[PDB]
Amino acid sequence: YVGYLQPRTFLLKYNENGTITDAVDCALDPLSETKCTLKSFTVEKGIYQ
Amino acid sequence: VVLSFELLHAPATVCGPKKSTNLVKNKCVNFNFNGLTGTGVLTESNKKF
Numbered sequence: 290y291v292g293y294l295q296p297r298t299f300l301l302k303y304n305e306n307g308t309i310t311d312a313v314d315c316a317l318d319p320l321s322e323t324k325c326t327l328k329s330f331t332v333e334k335g336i337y338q
Numbered sequence: 339v340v341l342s343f344e345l346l347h348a349p350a351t352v353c354g355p356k357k358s359t360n361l362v363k364n365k366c367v368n369f370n371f372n373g374l375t376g377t378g379v380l381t382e383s384n385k386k387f
């Protein structure tokens with residue numbers, strides 16, 4: 290498999306042992322953009338600019 | 339002759355002639371680890387590197 294990288298901002302989650310267990314691509318969709326803006330993987334009900 | 343220096347943080351691998359002083363722990367000491375200069379106290383770390 291062959292892919293190509295692009296300049297994208299990411300939100301990486303570090304666990305207690307310092308290993309990346311989850312990540313969020315900010316430009317993938319509006320929900321991920323909201324997660325990036327709030328700097329949290331969990332977003333409560335509401336409206337976010 | 340133009341000497342171009344690139345000053346990164348972690349990978350140094352190039353240091354001028356200096357004497358490696360013995361390790362001192364559990365007291366306020368100004369350490370210098372490959373340029374990382376700062377006052378602090380040394381303690382055993384149990385995190386998974």
Ligand SMILES: *[C@@H]1O[C@H](CO)[C@@H](O)[C@H](O)[C@H]1NC(C)=O
Pocket residue numbers: 304305306386
């Ligand atoms: C971190 O490492 C310790 C070592 O035993 C392990 O018990 C723990 O489950 C690990 N935590 C992770 C992988 O999130």
